[PDB]
Paper text:
The TRPC subfamily are non-selective cation channels (Na+, K+, Ca2+) that alter proliferation, vascular tone, and synaptic plasticity. [name] is broadly expressed in human tissues and can assemble as homomeric channels or form heteromeric channels with TRPC1 and TRPC54–7.
Each monomer consists of a transmembrane domain (TMD) and a compact cytosolic domain. The cytosolic domain of [name] adopts a pedestal-like architecture. The narrowest constriction of the ion conduction pathway (3.6 Å) is formed by the S6 side chains of Asn621, while in TRPM4, the 5.1 Å wide lower gate is positioned at Ile1040. The simplest hypothesis, with these caveats in mind, is that [name] is in a closed or inactivated state since the lower gate is too narrow to allow the passage of a fully or partially hydrated ion. A strong non-protein density peak in our [name] structure is present in a hydrophilic pocket on the cytoplasmic side of the S1–S4 fold, consistent with the corresponding location of a presumed Ca2+ in TRPM421. We tentatively modeled this non-protein density as Na+ since sodium was the most abundant cation in our purification buffer. Eight densities corresponding to lipid molecules were clearly resolved and identified as cholesteryl hemisuccinates (CHS) and phospholipids (the density fitting ceramide-1-phosphate or phosphatidic acid).
Residue numbers in the entry:
A (entry chain C): 15 to 118, 134 to 174, 188 to 273, 285 to 388, 393 to 460, 463 to 660, 692 to 755
B (entry chain B): 505 to 655
C (entry chain B): 706 to 755
D (entry chain A): 15 to 118, 134 to 174, 188 to 273, 285 to 388, 393 to 460, 463 to 665, 692 to 755
E (entry chain B): 152 to 174, 188 to 273, 285 to 302
C-alpha cells in the first residue's frame, strides 16, 4: 500500500492497571504503598503478588535492580516467587544476596546450566563467592565418556573455574591451579576451533592471575619459598614448562634469576660495557684453563669458578667459537681419491664433533623428545650433527677400499659427498651464533621477533610453491617440444649461454626460482626453431609469473610481515625474557658443565614435607590475602560509572523522600 | 626528516649484525664446497669485478664479496659452475646460493622493511620536539664568540 | 630567581590542582561518598523526628 | 648526611586558625556559620573578610568552586575583594556570574591580558558570552606597527575570536568570519614557527564550525540562499578559494553540486555501470556533433545539450583522447634535413595545439598567476604547451634555410631538437589522463593520495641528491687519473662494453644513478692499468653507495611513505571530494565550453532596483542565518551534555547540595 | 599520590626521606624505587626544593641512568624520568612575561640554564 502498519506480533496479556500501579509503587522506593498493596492481597482481588512486566521484572527483580534492601525484606516477608532472583542479585554484586540465601518454562534469563556459584565466579566478586562457598556448593567436572548446551555448559564450568576468586579461595595452591588451568584452556582452545577466542581469553586470564600473585610478593625470602616448592628452582621449571611467559619477568623473578646467574660477581651489571667486553674476552680466552679444573679438583677456586653459570655460557660459547675459527682455518690449509683423516685440522676436529653428538644424546636423555623437538634449534642440532656423522662416516669409508685419479671421479664418489655434506654442516654450525643473541639485551628481542615472523613466512611460501608448480607445468608443457638442444655442453642454466631453460621440469623450477632475482635473462625463452607465437606465449607466461611473484606476492609478503611485526613487538621484552631465562636456566644445573671437547674426555621426609608445605601455605595465605585486597581496591578505580549506579543514588533520594513525607504528612 | 632517519640508523645497525652472521654462514659453506673444485690460476682477469667472473667462491674473501654483491643483481648464475664436471657439487652449491638469496633478499630484507615501519611510526610521534632540540644544539653552537671565523 | 620560582610554583600548583578536576572520569568511590552523605544525613533527620 | 631534610622553602604566613575555621565554614555550605563569622567582622578582631589560603582561595572562590549561589549573595552583600573572582566564575560555566556582573600584585591566576569576554570565548559557553555582550565588551584588534605577552595576548585574541559563539553572536555572517578567520589562522601559523600547532588547531576549529552550520541546513531552498550569496555559486567559489575542504562535502552540498553537474539527467546515477560506459562512449564519440552546435545555434536542443557540465567533461576529455590516439597514430606513419610540416598528421595537429595554448592563456586571463601556479597540473600544462611552441617553432625554422644529408647531421640540427622536445611533450601530454581520475569514485581518492605523497617524496630526493654528489665526488676523484680510454668508440656507459664509467663527473652521476637499478655491472670499476688497491677502494666506495642508497635510504623511503599514507588515508574522501568539486566546478561556467580544436575556430577540419535586490537578498540571508545560528547553538548546547565524562567537580556540586541542605535542616530542628 | 595539600600537612610536622645510596633483595630495590618514586613527584619538588629545575633535571638524569643500570624495573624508572622531564616543561609553561623567562634561562649558580638543560637531554624543556 502507501503506508506500512505496525502491530505487536509477539504479545502477552500484558498487565492489569492496578498491577501496573503496584509495580509503579516499587521502582520509586515506596515502603508505605508497597506494604499497603501487599496487604490488600489474600482478599485477593485482583493484584497477584507475582506479577510480571512485559520486560521481565517479577516484582522482586525491581527491588534488586533498583538496589533497595528494605523492599527485599518486605517482599521476602511475604511469599514472592523467588526463583530465580538470587542469580539477578549476583550480576549487580548486591550483597543483599544474604537475604536470598538465609531466607526463603517461566522465562529464566539465564541458561539453565547456571548454578549460583558459576555466575558468582563469572562476576569475579570475592564476597559473594565466599557467601556461597560457606553454604555449598559444587561445580561439575567437565570431562565425559543437545550440543549447544554441552559446549556452552562446559565453557561456563571452565569460565567459572578460571576466575581468580575461586582460585584464591577453594584451591590448595593457586599457582598450580592457574598453570594447569591455563594449559587446559590453551590446549582446549586448540581442540575446538569454535569458541577459540573465549578459551584463549580465559587462559590469558589465568596467565595474568599468577603474575599478579607474584606482584604481591614482597620481601624475599617470600619469593624463594614460592620458586622452590617441589610437591633447584622447581616452580620456575614448572612455569617454563607450562609456557607462563608473564609469570617469568615478574620483574621480581628476574632479580632472583639474574643474581643466581651472576653468583657472586660484585656489581658486574654496573661496569662499563668495554670493560665487560675485556672480561668476557679474557675469560673466553682461558676456557681450557677453567675447564681442566673441575676435572682435577672440583673443590677448588677454579673448580668452583666454572660452576658460575655466567662463566658456563662464556665459555661454552667460547669453545664453540674456537670450533668456528677452526672451521675458518680448515679451508685455508693444504688445498687423492682416498685421503687420510684430512688434515691435521680434522684430527683436531673429532673431539669437538663427538662432543656435540654426546651433548645432544645427553640432552635427549633428560627430557624429550616432545620438549626436544619443540624447540627448532635442537632440530637444527640434529641435522647438523647428523651431517657430521655422515661426513666422518664417508671419510672413514673413503679411507678404506679406495686409493688415484685427480678429478675424473664417479660424481657420487664419497669424498665429494663428504665435502658437500661437510659444507652444509658448516652452514648449519655457523648459523648457531644467532641463537646466542638472547643473552644480549640489544640483539635479544630482535632475534626472537624475527623467529616469530618465520612461522608466518613459512605459511606464505606454500602459496609460492604452488605458483612455481603452476608456471612450471605451463612452461615445461610449452617448451619440452620446441627446446631440447643436446649437441653441446654447457647445458644451461648455471651457464654462460643459458641454453635449455624450460626443457625439463626440474630445470624449469630452477629457471623460475632463479628468475625471482634478476639472474635469468630474456634470451632464455627463445626457440632454436622459428616459432614466434610459442615464443611470445612462453614469454607472456614468464611475464605474468614475474608480475605475480615479484609485484603481487612479494609485496603481499612485505605487508604480511608489517602486520605481523606490529603484533609481535607489543609482546616483545616479555617474550625475549622468557627465552633468556630458558637460556639462563639451561646453565643452572650441574654436569651439564664441561665445554664441548672436554665433555667426554623415615620421619624426616614427613617433617620436611609438613614444614615446606605449611610454610608455603602460610606464604600463600599472605599473598591471597593482600591480592584480594589489591583487586578489590582496583575494582574502584575503573574511571567509568555505569548508568545503574545512578539508579542506586536516585532511589536513595527517592525512598528517603517517601519516608520523610510519611512522617510529616 | 634527517633526524628521523638518524634515529632509524641505530635500529638498522642492530639488524646488519644478523646479516653479517648470515654472510659468515653461507660464506663458510660456499668456500668449503668450492675451494677444491674451483681454482683457475691460468689467466687474468681473476673474477669478480671482471667481464667473465671466473673464481667466485675460491677464497673466503672473494666469497664474501660474491654474496655481498649478490644482494644486488650483479652476480650471475654461471658463477657457480665448476671447470670440471661435477653436477652434484654444482647443484648443492647453487642451492646454497639460492637459500642465501631467499634468506637475505626475501626474508631478512623485508623484515628490515617491517622493522623500519614500526620504528618510523614510533619516531614520528616525538619528531618536532626532537628536531627542535637538535636545532637548538646547532643554533646554540653559534652563540658563543671565537668561535666565529669561517674555516 | 627564588622570587620568580615562588611565582611559578604558586601558579603551577594552582594549575595542576585545577587539572585534577577535569579528568572526565569518576571512580566508583565518589559514588561511595555521595551515597553516604545522603545516608548519614538520613540517620540524623530520622534521629530528630522519631 | 644519612637523611635529607624537607623544609618548606617557599612559605607564606600562612593563616590564623580562626581564619582557617572561617574558610572551613565555607566549603561545607554553612549559611549560618558564615553569616555569624561575617557579622563578627567590624569588631574586627581578628578575622579579616578577605583571607587567602596557601592555595589561592580568596574566600569567594570557594563559593564558586563549590557552586553555591547563596554564599555568593552573602559574601557580595558584604565587601569581599572581588577582583578577579568573576573570571573564576566563567571557567566553571557558573551562571551565577550575573551576580558578579549586576552587583559589586595579588596573585591573579590569569595572564593580565585576559578580559572577561576573552575567557568567556575560550570556554565557548553561549550563555555567559551573551551575558557579557549585553554589557560591553570590546576585544582589541590584533595588528600593530615584552615578547611573551605580545604573542600570548595575540593568541588569546585570535583564540577568542575563533570561538563558535562569538561567531554565532556578534558577526554579520558567520560564514565569512569562519572562512576569513581560518585563512588568517592558517597563514598566521605559517608565519610563526612557534605556536604552530595552536593556530592550526584554531583554524581547524573555524573550518569545522562552518561545516556544522551547513549540517544545520534543512530544506533547500535554505541551502541555495547560502551557496549563492554574493555580497553562479559564489559562496562555493569563495569556499574553495579559502580551502574549506570540509565545508564542501557537507554532504548536503554534494547533492546541490551533483544535481547541477547532471542537469537534468533522469536518474543517471542509478543505472548500470556498463550502460554508463556505453552512454559515455557514444556521447564521447559524437564530440564534433554536439560542438558544431553551440556555434550554429546556441538556442537549440543540441546547443543546450553541451551546456550540461557532465556533457562538457565527456566530451572535453573525448577530444583530448582523440588528440592522444592521433599522437599514437603519429609514430606509425611514413617512417630530409628540411621537412614539410610533417606529416598530414601534424597538419591535423595544429588546431589542437593552438587550442591548448589558447586554453591556457584564456585560463590565465580569468585568475592567476597565484591560483594558476598553485595547482601543479597547470604548471605541467605550461611546460607541455611551451614544448609545443618550441616544437612547431623549430619545425618552421627547420622548413626555412635548410634543404640533403640522410643522417650525418649537426647533432643540434633543429629537426632533432624538435623531435626530442616533441617526444617529451608527448610524455607530458599523455600523463594528463591521470588528472582525469578525480571524476571517478574508485580511481579518484587513490590518485589524490599519491599526489599528496609526492611532496613527501620530493623532500627525500634532496638527501639522495647529496649522496649522489658525495659518492660522485669520491669516485670521480679516484678514477679521473687511472681511467681515461679515448682510443675507441663506443665510450661507455649506454654501451655494450661500459668502458669509462667514473672518468668525468657527469658520467659518474650517470653511473651511480643507473646503479640504483641493476643496470651497471662490476667490471665497470676496473682500471686498464694494474692497481688493485685503487680498484678495491673504488669498489668499496661503490659498495657503500649501494648499501646507503639501496638498503638504507630506499627502505627509509618505503617507511616514510607508510607513515605518510596512513596519515593521508584518514582525510581521503573529504579531500578527494574537494578536488572533485574543483574539477566539477571548472565546467559550470559558460565559454568556457568548446573542446580544444573548436575553441578558436569556426570549426577547423585539419538605480533603486539594485538597492531592492541587495536588501532583499541581504535580509533573506540574515533570516536564514538567524535560523541556522539558532538551531546550531541549540545543537551544540545539546552536545555539551553527551560527553560521557564527568569531571570530579560535578561531584563537588552534588556533595555541597546535600551538605548545605543538611546545614539548613539541622538549623530548623535544633 | 601527588596531592599537594597532604604533602604540606606532613612537611609541617616532619618528615625525612632516606637517601638512596649504600656501601633481602626485593625490599632493597622496592624501597629504593619507592624513595626515587617519592622524590620524583612534582609536589615534593614544588615544596621542599631550593630550585625545582635542578631537582627535575638531576632527578631525570639519575632515573634515566638508573634505568640503564637495572634491566629489571626499567619501564618504571623511565616513567619517573619522563615525569621529571614533563614537570620542568610545565614550569616553563607557567612562565608569563619575559623578563621572568630570562631570569630562569640565565641562572648561573650567556644562557647557562639552557646549556645545562641540553646537557641533561631535556628535550621537552627546550621547545
Ligand atoms: C593469481 C594468483 C596470484 C595473485 C594474483 C595476481 C594478480 C593478477 C596479476 C596481473 C597479471 C600481470 C600483468 C600481465 C603481465 C604482462 O603483461 O606480461 C606479458 C607481456 C610482457 O612482455 P612480453 O609480451 O614480451 O612477455 O606484456 C606485454 O606484451 C607488454 C605490455 C604489457 C604491459 C604490462 C602492464 C601490466 C602492469 C604490470 C607491472 C606492474 C608494475 C608495478 C610497479 C608500478
Ligand atoms: C635461518 C636464519 C635466517 C632466517 C630464516 C630463513 C627462513 C628459511 C629460508 C627458506 C630457505 C629458502 C628456500 C630454499 C632456497 C632454494 O630452493 O634454492 C635452491 C634451489 C634453487 O636453484 P638451484 O637448485 O639451481 O640452486 O632450489 C631448486 O632447485 C629449484 C626449486 C626450488 C624452488 C624454491 C621454492 C622456495 C621459495 C623461495 C622463494 C620465495 C620468493 C618470495 C616471493 C613470492
Ligand atoms: C651515511 C648517511 C646515509 C645513511 C647512513 C648509512 C648507514 C651506514 C651504512 C653502512 C655501510 C655499508 C656497509 C659497507 C659496504 C661494504 O661492505 O662494501 C665494501 C665491500 C664490498 O665488496 P668490495 O670489497 O668488493 O667492494 O665489502 C667487502 O669487502 C666484502 C665484505 C663486506 C660485507 C658487507 C657487510 C655489510 C652488510 C651490508 C649489506 C646489508 C644487506 C641487508 C639485507 C640483509
Ligand atoms: C661482526 C661479524 C664479523 C661477526 C663476528 C663474529 C663473533 C665475533 C660474534 C658473533 C656473535 C657474537 C656473540 C653474540 C652474543 C653474545 C652474547 C653476549 O653475552 C652477553 O651479553 C653477556 C650476558 C650479559 O650481558 O648479561 C656477548 C658474547 C656473545 C657470545 C657474542 C660474542 C661474539 C660473537 C660470537
Ligand atoms: C592514449 C589512448 C590509447 C587512451 C588510453 C587510455 C584510456 C583507455 C583510459 C585511461 C584513463 C581513462 C579515463 C579515466 C577516468 C575517466 C573518468 C570517468 O568519468 C567518470 O567517472 C564519469 C563521472 C561519473 O562517474 O559521475 C570515465 C571516463 C574517463 C575519462 C576514462 C576514459 C578512458 C581513459 C582515458
Ligand atoms: Na643443543
Ligand atoms: Na635487480
Ligand atoms: Na589547464
Amino acid at each position: 500500500r502507501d503506508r506500512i502498519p505496525l502491530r505487536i506480533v509477539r504479545a502477552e496479556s500484558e498487565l492489569s492497571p492496578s498491577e501496573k500501579a503496584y509495580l509503579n509503587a516499587v521502582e520509586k522506593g515506596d515502603y508505605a504503598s508497597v506494604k499497603k498493596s501487599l496487604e490488600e492481597a489474600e482478599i485477593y482481588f485482583k493484584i497477584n503478588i507475582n506479577c510480571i512486566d512485559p520486560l521481565g521484572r517479577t516484582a522482586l527483580l525491581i527491588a534488586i535492580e533498583n538496589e533497595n534492601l528494605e523492599l527485599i525484606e518486605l517482599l521476602l516477608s511475604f511469599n514472592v516467587y523467588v526463583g530465580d532472583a538470587l542469580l539477578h542479585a549476583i550480576r549487580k554484586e548486591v550483597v543483599g544476596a544474604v537475604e536470598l540465601l538465609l531466607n526463603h518454562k517461566q522465562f529464566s534469563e539465564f541458561t539453565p546450566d547456571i548454578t549460583p556459584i558459576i555466575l558468582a565466579a563469572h562476576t569475579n566478586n570475592y564476597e559473594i563467592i565466599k557467601l556461597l562457598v560457606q553454604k555449598g556448593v559444587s561445580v561439575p567436572r567437565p570431562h565425559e565418556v543437545d550440543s549447544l548446551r554441552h559446549s556452552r555448559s562446559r565453557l561456563n564450568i571452565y569460565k567459572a573455574l578460571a576466575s581468580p576468586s575461586l582460585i584464591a579461595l577453594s584451591s590448595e595452591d593457586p599457582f598450580l591451579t592457574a598453570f594447569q588451568l591455563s594449559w587446559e584452556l590453551q590446549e582446549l582452545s586448540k581442540v575446538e576451533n569454535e569458541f577459540k577466542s573465549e578459551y584463549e581469553e580465559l587462559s590469558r586470564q589465568c596467565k595474568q592471575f599468577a603474575k599478579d600473585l607474584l606482584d604481591q610478593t614482597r620481601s624475599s625470602r617470600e619469593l624463594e619459598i614460592i620458586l622452590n616448592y617441589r610437591d633447584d628452582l622447581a616452580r620456575l621449571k614448572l612455569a617454563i614448562k607450562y609456557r607462563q611467559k608473564e609469570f617469568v619477568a615478574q620483574p621480581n623473578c628476574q632479580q632472583l634469576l639474574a643474581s643466581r646467574w651472576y653468583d657472586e660477581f660484585p656489581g658486574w651489571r654496573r661496569r662499563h660495557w668495554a670493560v665487560k667486553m675485556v672480561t668476557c674476552f679474557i675469560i673466553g680466552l682461558l676456557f681450557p684453563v677453567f675447564s681442566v679444573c673441575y676435572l682435577i679438583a672440583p673443590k677448588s677456586p677454579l673448580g668452583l669458578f666454572i660452576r658460575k653459570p655466567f662463566i658456563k655460557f662464556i665459555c661454552h660459547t667460547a669453545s664453540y667459537l674456537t670450533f668456528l675459527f677452526l672451521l675458518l682455518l680448515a679451508s685455508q690449509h693444504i688445498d687423492n681419491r682416498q685421503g687420510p683423516p684430512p688434515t691435521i685440522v680434522e684430527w683436531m676436529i673429532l673431539p669437538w664433533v663427538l662432543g656435540f653428538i654426546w651433548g645432544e644424546i645427553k640432552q635427549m636423555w633428560d627430557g624429550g623428545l616432545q620438549d626436544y623437538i619443540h624447540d627448532w634449534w635442537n632440530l637444527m642440532d640434529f641435522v647438523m650433527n647428523s651431517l657430521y656423522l655422515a661426513t666422518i662416516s664417508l671419510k672413514i669409508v673413503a679411507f678404506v677400499k679406495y686409493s688415484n685419479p685427480r678429478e675424473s671421479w664417479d660424481m657420487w664418489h664419497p669424498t665429494l659427498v663428504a665435502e658437500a655434506l661437510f659444507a652444509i654442516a658448516n652452514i648449519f654450525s655457523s648459523l648457531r651464533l644467532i641463537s646466542l643473541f638472547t643473552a644480549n639485551s640489544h640483539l635479544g628481542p630482535l632475534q626472537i621477533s624475527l623467529g616469530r615472523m618465520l612461522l608466518d613466512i613459512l605459511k606464505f611460501l606454500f602459496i609460492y610453491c604452488l605458483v612455481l608448480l603452476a608456471f612450471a607445468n605451463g612452461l615445461n608443457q610449452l617448451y619440452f617440444y620446441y627446446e631440447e638442444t643436446k649437441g653441446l655442453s654447457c647445458k644451461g642454466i648455471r651457464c654462460e649461454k643459458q641454453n635449455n631453460a624450460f626443457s625439463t621440469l626440474f630445470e624449469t623450477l630452477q629457471s623460475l626460482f632463479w628468475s625471482i632475482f634478476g639472474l635469468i635473462n630474456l634470451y632464455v625463452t627463445n626457440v632454436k626453431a622459428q616459432h614466434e607465437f610459442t615464443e611470445f606465449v612462453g614469454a607472456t607466461m614468464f611475464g605474468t609469473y614475474n608480475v605475480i611473484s615479484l609485484v603481487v606476492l612479494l609485496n603481499m609478503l612485505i605487508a604480511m610481515m608489517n602486520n605481523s611485526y606490529q603484533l609481535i613487538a607489543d609482546h616483545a621484552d616479555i617474550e625475549w625474557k622468557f627465552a633468556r631465562t630458558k637460556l639462563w636456566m639451561s646453565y643452572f644445573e650441574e654436569g651439564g658443565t664441561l665445554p664441548t671437547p672436554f665433555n667426554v674426555i623415615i620421619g624426616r621426609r614427613a617433617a620436611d614435607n609438613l614444614r615446606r608445605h605449611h610454610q608455603y601455605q602460610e606464604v600463600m595465605r599472605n599473598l591471597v590475602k593482600r591480592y584480594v585486597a589489591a583487586m578489590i581496591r582496583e575494582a574502584k578505580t575503573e574511571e567509568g560509572l555505569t548508568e545503574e549506579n545512578v539508579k542506586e543514588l536516585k532511589q536513595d533520594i527517592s525512598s528517603f523522600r517517601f519516608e520523610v513525607l510519611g512522617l510529616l504528612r
